């Protein structure tokens, strides 16, 4: 293959998403805790989160990942699909990743066009594109329910 395909596969085979917390950015209280690897591609993951998260002005997303491979510029492109059409796009950059390292990464998700939980629940899918700089490594998807 292009050998970039092989590098991308190398990075993916050595990557794990170990845990993720979603916090109310006002209090730090944990609204949702996940220990399963919801970055695995080729599946449609599901996350059931408390509907009150929709009333937080901001959510602090704190995750922990491991990577056997070095990355020059680990970053995410995330698309929020509502009823199959892109509603919002998020961009987050981690930067350099030491080979065989385990790293905690905090990002703030900030807010309007806010719809009720009954409308959003089961109709929101987050597509996450995992890049090292300009190299697309993987794409994973999670469907959100607001309970
Ligand atoms: C227009 C908005 C409509 C929809 C609601 C917006 C979403 N809301 C945001 C708040 C903001 C403040 N106003 C209220 C709403 S929300 O419901 O609180 C999201 C909680 C967090 C959503 N989330 N969930 C999971 C499970 C994620 C995973 C697995 N990965 C991931 C990371 C790295 C890799 C490699 C792969 C995947 N990233 C995830 C992620 O971002």
Structural domain that includes position 33:
4-146
Residue closest via CA to ligand 1's atom 23 equals: 126
The torsion angles phi and psi of 137, rounded to 5 degrees, stand at -95, -50
Structure-determination approach: X-ray
Radius of gyration of the chain (CA): 16
- Count structural domains, the chain: 1
Residue written as token pair 């209280």:
29
Q: What is the resolution of this structure in A?
A: 1.6
Tokens representing 61 are 């997303």
Our CA dihedral for 132, 135, 137, 138, rounded to 10 degrees, sits at: 110
Residue closest via CA to ligand 1's atom 18 equals: 53
Residues in contact with ligand 1 (CB, 6 Å cut-off): 17, 20, 22, 38-39, 47, 49, 53-54, 56, 58-59, 61, 63, 76, 80, 87-88, 109, 111, 113, 120, 124, 126, 128, 130, 140, 142, 144
Report the side by side order of strands in the sheet with 85-97.
44-49, 135-146, 124-132, 71-82, 85-97
CB 114 within 8 A of CB 52: no
CB 49 within 8 A of CB 147: yes
* Ligand 1 atom, smallest distance to 138 CA: 35
Q: How far apart are CA 52 and CA 30, in angstroms?
A: 12
Q: How far apart are CA 147 and CA 144, in angstroms?
A: 10
CB 13 within 8 A of CB 5: no
CA of 8 to the centre of ligand 1 (A): 24
CA of 105 to the centre of ligand 1 (A): 14
* Residue 114 CB partners (closer than 8 Å, separation 6+): 54
Q: What is the CATH number of the domain that holds 80?
A: 2.70.50.40
DSSP letters, 57-120, are SEEEEEEEEEESS-EEEEEEEEEEEETTEEEEEEEEEEEEE-TTEEEEEEEEEE------HHHH
Q: How far apart are CA 92 and CA 134, in angstroms?
A: 14
């Amino acid at each position: 293959m292009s050998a970039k395909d092989e590098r991308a596969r190398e990075i993916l085979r050595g990557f794990k998403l170990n845990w993720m917390n979603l916090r109310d950015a006002e209090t730090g209280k944990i609204l949702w805790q996940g220990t399963e690897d919801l970055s695995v591609p080729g599946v449609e993951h599901e996350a059931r989160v408390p509907k009150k998260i929709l009333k937080c002005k901001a959510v602090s997303r704190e995750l922990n990942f491991s990577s056997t491979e070095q990355m020059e510029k680990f970053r995410l492109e995330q698309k929020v699909y509502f009823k199959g059409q892109c509603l919002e796009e998020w961009f987050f950059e981690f930067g350099f990743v030491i080979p065989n390292s385990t790293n905690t990464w905090q990002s703030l998700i900030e807010a309007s066009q806010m719809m009720p939980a009954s409308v959003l629940t089961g109709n929101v899918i987050i597509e996450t594109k995992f890049f090292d700089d300009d190299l697309l490594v993987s794409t994973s998807r999670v469907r959100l329910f607001y309970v």
